[PDB]
């Protein structure tokens, strides 16, 4: 006939019927819980910020965010750890600007 199941190409393989399952419970390691979110920001308001974070937030006040991305990347090491560190710190400045406008 037409469209024999073929061993090369885009749609390849032996054409099997997949079952859906409840996933393995180890797949939710490191998903944020409500209670551990509450612990982790009680600590931040009682400990503050590290001096590289406190310096990187100053480069983000003056809209100098390429240099703040390069600075964070120099200190934590990886591009993807830096650009989620930056948007974390930007949510600190966006929250602190809003909380001080009132």
């Amino acid at each position: 006939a037409l469209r024999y199941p073929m061993a090369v190409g885009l749609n390849k393989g032996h054409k099997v019927t997949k079952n859906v399952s409840k996933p393995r419970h180890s797949r939710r390691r490191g998903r944020l819980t409500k209670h551990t979110k509450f612990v982790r920001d009680m600590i931040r308001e009682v400990c503050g910020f590290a001096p590289y974070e406190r310096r990187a937030m100053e480069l983000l006040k003056v809209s100098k965010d390429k240099r703040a991305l390069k600075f964070i990347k120099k200190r934590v090491g990886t591009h993807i750890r830096a650009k989620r560190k930056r948007e974390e710190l930007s949510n600190v400045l966006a929250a602190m600007r809003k909380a001080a406008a009132k």
Partner: protein
């Protein structure tokens, strides 16, 4: 057996088969493959051309399972089945062709060396040559792909 070797015939002759002039020494000329560019150059160029240098692209972690493709030629294709399969297909009034799955016989590609006997056959393989799948259609058969 040590009773059939040259050492038992060379047991009165001083040099023991290695000459008075030259001698039998330890390693006259280096050890192993020493000197293949310098003093054993003529031996490597006369007999092993290509021995020195790099050609082609490196490929780390070659996993030879994912390039497995054993081939069967087209003339050893009816040997994959019994003989009453081939014989009863020739006697058949209705045009029924038997099936030859080469994958259960351990082959993935069919190659087209040879000649087929003149009767239709359905061949199920994973791969075909161009002119292997037109020596099946000319005998009157069909090619079927299996993944």
């Amino acid at each position: 057996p040590s009773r059939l070797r040259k050492t038992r015939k060379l047991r009165g002759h001083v040099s023991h088969g290695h000459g008075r002039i030259g001698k039998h020494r330890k390693h006259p000329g280096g050890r192993g493959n020493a000197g293949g560019l310098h003093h054993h150059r003529i031996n490597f160029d006369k007999y092993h051309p290509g021995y020195f240098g790099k050609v082609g692209m490196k490929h780390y972690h070659l996993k030879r399972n994912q390039s497995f493709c054993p081939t069967v030629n087209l003339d050893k294709l009816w040997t994959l089945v019994s003989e009453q399969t081939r014989v009863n297909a020739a006697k058949n009034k209705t045009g029924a062709a038997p099936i030859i799955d080469v994958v259960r016989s351990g082959y993935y590609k069919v190659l087209g060396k040879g000649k087929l006997p003149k009767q239709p056959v359905i061949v199920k393989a994973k791969f075909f040559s161009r002119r292997a799948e037109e020596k099946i259609k000319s005998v009157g058969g069909a090619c079927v792909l299996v993944a």
